Amino acid sequence: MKSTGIVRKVDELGRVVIPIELRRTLGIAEKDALEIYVDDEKIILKKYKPNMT
Amino acid sequence: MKSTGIVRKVDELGRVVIPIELRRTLGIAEKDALEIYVDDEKIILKKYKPNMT
User: Fold this and answer.
1) Residue B36: which of A30, A20, A27 has the closest Cα?
2) A11, B7, B23, B52: which could join B28 in a potential S-S bond, CB 3.0 to 4.6 Å?
3) Comparing C-alpha atoms, which of B26, B29, B42, B3 is closest to residue A9?
4) Which residue of A has its CA nearest to B40?
5) A16 vs B51: CA distance, rounded Å
6) What is the CATH number of the domain that holds B23?
7) What are the start-end ranges of the E strands in B1-53?
8) Which residue does chain A place closest to B10, by CA atoms?
9) How far apart are CA B15 and CA A53, in angstroms?
10) Residue B51 near chain A (CB below 8 Å)
11) Number of domains observed in the structure of chain B
């Protein structure tokens, strides 16, 4: 499990329903955060750094 | 406008609220679709191909 090549809708408020399977791949969650970047034209979602002090 | 290095929550249903600004950058919308992939450990959101026959 990795790249799916799978499209999703951005829902309504601007939240893209990132499939549970994918966020399972990165081991993120809904209450989790994603550190988003963009490579010129494309979006890069990393999982938020789980650094809790 | 491009990479922000900006984190967002995955909401509740599994939809990450991708900031309006970012989707403003890639020319997407909330009714739009995003062709999501993953590079080993990270998520890659491209905007869905606007090819409408």
Assistant:
1) A20
2) B23
3) B29
4) A2
5) 20
6) 2.10.260.10
7) 6-9, 15-17, 33-39, 42-47
8) A30
9) 27
10) no
11) 1
